[PDB]
Every structure is written in structure tokens, then in C-alpha cells.
Amino acid sequence: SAHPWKAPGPNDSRGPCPGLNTLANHGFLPRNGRNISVPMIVKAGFEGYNVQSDILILAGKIGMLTSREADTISLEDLKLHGTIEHDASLSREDVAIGDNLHFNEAIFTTLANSNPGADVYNISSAAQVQHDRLADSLARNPNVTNTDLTATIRSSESAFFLTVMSAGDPLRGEAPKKFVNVFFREERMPIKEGWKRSTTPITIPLLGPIIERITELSDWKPTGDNCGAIVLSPEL
Amino acid sequence: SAHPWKAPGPNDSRGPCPGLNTLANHGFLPRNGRNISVPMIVKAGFEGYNVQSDILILAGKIGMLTSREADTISLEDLKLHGTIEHDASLSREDVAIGDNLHFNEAIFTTLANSNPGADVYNISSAAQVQHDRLADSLARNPNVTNTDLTATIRSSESAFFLTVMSAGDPLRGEAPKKFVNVFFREERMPIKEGWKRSTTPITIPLLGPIIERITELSDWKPTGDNCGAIVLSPEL
Numbered sequence A, B: 001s002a003h004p005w006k007a008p009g010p011n012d013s014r015g016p017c018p019g020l021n022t023l024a025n026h027g028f029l030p031r032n033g034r035n036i037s038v039p040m041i042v043k044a045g046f047e048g049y050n051v052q053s054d055i056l057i058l059a060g061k062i063g064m065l066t067s068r069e070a071d072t073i074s075l076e077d078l079k080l081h082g083t084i085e086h087d088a089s090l091s092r093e094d095v096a097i098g099d100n101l102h103f104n105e106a107i108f109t110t111l112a113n114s115n116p117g118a119d120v121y122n123i124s125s126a127a128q129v130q131h132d133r134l135a136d137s138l139a140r141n142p143n144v145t146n147t148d149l150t151a152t153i154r155s156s157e158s159a160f161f162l163t164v165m166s167a168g169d170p171l172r173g174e175a176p177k178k179f180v181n182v183f184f185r186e187e188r189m190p191i192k193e194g195w196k197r198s199t200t201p202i203t204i205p206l207l208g209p210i211i212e213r214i215t216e217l218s219d220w221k222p223t224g225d226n227c228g229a230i231v232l233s234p235e236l
């Protein structure tokens, strides 16, 4: 145990991402959530989850745009709405109507109740969850943003939790609820529950067919202009 | 001084930006134009031009998206169309109809002929030049992309040449043609011609009103859907 879970203190920076928060809570990233570069993310995601540099370099550099520093962020910076952070999250509220940063059990209810009768979440349950979370945002949020880009990011995130928290073969696109629930609710690797780091590297080619299938099953259409413009920096 | 101009060799990476290419030609950045990080850009831009970290961090991190590396680029990477690189450049051709990378004297005619009768370029001539370059792209390039984002970037780039190549007070928003011409044609600081690095720091608050006036005077309107989506990575 060079990497025990410790609950974050009130001054440790944490963001809207359970993947990065969990790595910080285990000391793979700095426990203070500060001064985190793309090379640090690449190493931490590799050591923690066997996630490879292809997706971590791509996502990491987009995430860097959310801070004012030359080559690092604080995890909380990633909450910046419209860079990566988006409406119809699995476990956070939409920023126009709530808190887009912290885990929120009420929001998480959709995911937690999904795939009724099974002990795993899987590609079809993820797609249904996405459909129902988006419908919620569309019903309740007058400023909802829902575009090809946010839809792809959302499927990427579902594919992330299905593969990183799997019971050992991430190709299957399924993960025990008991692992995924601990991941979201505690931002802890569920080691005592029996989870282990994937022995298969999790790469863009591995994720891509999972992402596409989730989208396909999600009965999705875009909203409004459908323009994939992102926010390129914090307020100037 | 210690930073002499040398022409780039065949293997020295150079991009579509005369600002960075010039820094590399004088060794403020690596002469080979490779392994360049945002902290390197921030330091070279300060040393070479007295351009401050606010604008270099903001633009630098967007530029980092153009490579496949965790935290560096080669200068040539910045040619990636639709991240920063755009149609209706001052000195390059649009990618759909030509070479969007190298200096091009025929394209440069519009700038080189602007502000007739005067010895400087200034805010109104920069605006007229942007107008006419965009008009050329609208005429000749069926694939033209012209959005709020590309217009802002273009005005920023004109504000850059006016300020950085000024006769010593960047607030004036004017620059001797002799200096600006050497800057674009040779990617050389025009030292023997009489230019010296600004003693006034060039910052976002200094540039903003110059950028806005350039746009205001340019008689500009968006094209097509006006969606400011950028390309977030080179080919996956």
C-alpha cells in the first residue's frame, strides 16, 4: 500500500471527474489536487487503471485549457462549463440549475437503479441511463447544451467507468455495480470489494466500439444549433 | 547580442506563425523548432518581444492541442487547420486551395500595399487588409470558414504585428512597414533596420482594445453557420 485511499480535506482540490478524483484520493495524483500536468495524468492513469497515454494526452490537453497556469491545473478547474464539463452528467447537476462539481446522490439515482436484476452495469444500461439523464436535462434546464461533441464525451465517460471498473476484462463493456457505485460515491478504488487494476491496456481503439455502441443504443438526437464550440480558457 | 538570426535548415520545424518562427530563428526558442512547451513559449515571448504570460499561456495551451505529445509541439504542428490556423491569413494561402504553412509573397501583397503614402501600418489599414483578405477567401475558396472565433484570432494576429514590431510604443497600434515586412518575409527581428524589443509589456489588457477596433473597422460579418468549433487533436 503505497497508495491507500484517504478522504480529501476541505482544502484539497477536487473536480467533476471521478476518475481523476479517485487517483488523487489514492496519491497517484497529488492528494492536494494541485499542480497537475498532463505527464502526471498520463502516469497516474497508467499506474492506477492501465489507461494509456493516447486518451490521456488527448483529454489532458483539453483539460489544461480550464486553468490560468502554463502547464498544470487544479482538479476543481475542470468544472469549467463548456470545455469538457457538460450537462446531463451521470452524478452531477447541470450548472444552470445546480452544482456541476460535486457528487450528488439524487442525480446518481438513475445510474444506481439501472440494469434492474443484474449485478453489473453494461453497454445497454449505460445507453438507457444516458437517454434518461439527457431527458431530465431537456425537461428541467432551459439552457441545456446537447451536441455531437457533448454526446461523444458522455459516451466516452460511460465507457470509462465500464472499462476501468470492470471485473478484469475491459473488452466486455461491463462492470460490477458494487465496483462502480464505490467509484462514484466514494471516489475510491474498490480494492476491498475485490477490484484490481485491469491487466489489459485501455486505449482509444479499445474504447471506440464501446462508445459507438452506447451512443447507438441511447436513442440520441442533438439540440438547438448543434455546434461543437468549446470554452478555450477561464474568464479573461 | 547573443541571439543572432540564422535561416532555418531543411530539418528545422517552422509553422504558420511569424511570431514563433522568428523566436526560433534567433534561438529564443530551439532553432530546430522541436520539443517546445508552453513555459518555453512564455519565456521566449517575454525575452524576445516583451509579450507577457497572460496571452502566451492562453494561446500556447490551445496550440498544444495540435501535436500528439503530452506537453510540447513542433512548430510545424501549428499548421493544423481549424485549431488556430485559419483561412484569410495575411501571408499564407487557405489550406483548401493552397499552402497554409509557408510565407507567400503573392498573398502578402494586400498587407504590403496597405496604408499607401504612409511609412507605418496602423489600426485602420490592418482592418482594411483583413476585410480584403477575407473577401479574397470568400471569392476563391468554396470551403472557407469564417466565424466569430476566426475573426477574433485574425484581429489578435494583426494586433500582434502592430504591437510587437512597433517603433517602441505598442499602445500606438502602429508599426513601421520596414519592420513588419522583414518580420513576415524573413522571420527575423529587424535589428539592423532599427527595431528594438518593446520596453512596454504587451498584455491582454493592452491588446484587447486594439483587437476590438481592428474588428470594428473591418466591416466584418460571419459566414455559414458561424460555429466556433475547433479541431481538438490531430487525426485519431
Ligand code: HEM
Pocket: A016, A017, A018, A019, A020, A041, A045, A049, A051, A056, A059, A060, A061, A062, A063, A064, A078, A079, A084, A085, A086, A087, A088, A089, A090, A091, A092, A157, A158, A160, A161, A164
Ligand atoms: C483517468 C481516467 C479517467 C476516468 C476513469 C474518468 C471517468 C470519468 C467519468 C465516469 C465521468 C462522468 C462523471 C459524471 O457524468 O457524473 C468523468 C467526467 C469528467 N472527466 Fe473524467 N475520467 C478520466 C480522465 C479524465 C481526464 C484525463 C480529464 C481531463 C483532464 C477528465 C475530465 C473530466 C471532466 C471535466 C468531467 C466532467 C464531465 C461532466 O460530467 O460534466 N477526465 N470522468
Ligand code: HEM
Pocket: B016, B017, B018, B019, B020, B041, B045, B049, B051, B056, B059, B060, B061, B062, B063, B064, B078, B079, B084, B085, B086, B087, B088, B089, B090, B091, B092, B157, B158, B160, B161, B164
Ligand atoms: C509570441 C508572440 C506571437 C506573435 C507576435 C505572433 C504573430 C502572429 C501573426 C502576425 C500571425 C498571422 C500570420 C498570417 O496571417 O499570415 C500569426 C499566426 C499564427 N500564430 Fe502566432 N504569434 C505569436 C504567438 C503565437 C503562439 C503562442 C501560438 C500558439 C502556440 C501561435 C500560433 C499561431 C498560428 C497557429 C498561426 C496561424 C494562423 C493563420 O494565419 O492561419 N502564435 N501569429
Ligand SMILES: *[C@@H]1O[C@H](CO)[C@@H](O[C@@H]2O[C@H](CO)[C@@H](O[C@@H]3O[C@H](CO)[C@@H](O)[C@H](O)[C@@H]3O)[C@H](O)[C@H]2NC(C)=O)[C@H](O)[C@H]1NC(C)=O
Pocket: A115, A116, A117, A118, A122, A123, A124, A125
Ligand atoms: C445488460 O444486462 C441486461 C440484464 O442482464 C441484459 O438484458 C437482459 O437480457 C436478457 C437476455 O436477452 C433478457 O431475458 C431474455 O429475456 C427474454 C424475455 O425478456 C426471455 O424470453 C429469455 O429467455 C431471456 O431470459 C432480459 O429480459 C434482459 N433484462 C433487462 C433488464 O433488460 C442485456 O442484454 C445486457 N446487455 C449487454 C449489451 O450485455
Ligand SMILES: *[C@@H]1O[C@H](CO)[C@@H](O[C@@H]2O[C@H](CO)[C@@H](O[C@H]3O[C@H](CO)[C@@H](O)[C@H](O)[C@@H]3O)[C@H](O)[C@H]2NC(C)=O)[C@H](O)[C@H]1NC(C)=O
Pocket: B115, B116, B117, B118, B122, B123, B124, B125
Ligand atoms: C492610418 O494611417 C493613415 C494614413 O496615414 C491615416 O489616414 C490618413 O488620415 C489623415 C489624417 O487625418 C488624412 O489626412 C487629411 O488631412 C487633411 C487636412 O489636414 C484633409 O483635408 C485631407 O482629407 C487629408 O486626407 C488622410 O485622409 C488619411 N490618409 C490616407 C492615405 O488615408 C489613418 O487615419 C491612420 N489610422 C489611424 C487609426 O491612425
Ligand SMILES: *[C@@H]1O[C@H](CO)[C@@H](O[C@@H]2O[C@H](CO)[C@@H](O)[C@H](O)[C@H]2NC(C)=O)[C@H](O)[C@H]1NC(C)=O
Pocket: A034, A035, A074
Ligand atoms: C501550484 O498550484 C497552486 C494552487 O493552484 C498555485 O498556488 C496558487 O498560485 C496562484 C498564482 O499566483 C495564486 O494566485 C493562488 O492564490 C495560489 N493558491 C494557493 C492555494 O496557494 C501555485 O502557483 C502552483 N505552483 C507552481 C510551482 O506553479
Ligand SMILES: [Mg+2]
Pocket: A016, A085, A086, A087, A088, A089, A092, A093, A094, A100
Ligand atoms: Mg456535468
Ligand SMILES: [Mg+2]
Pocket: B016, B085, B086, B087, B088, B089, B092, B093, B094, B100
Ligand atoms: Mg491560415
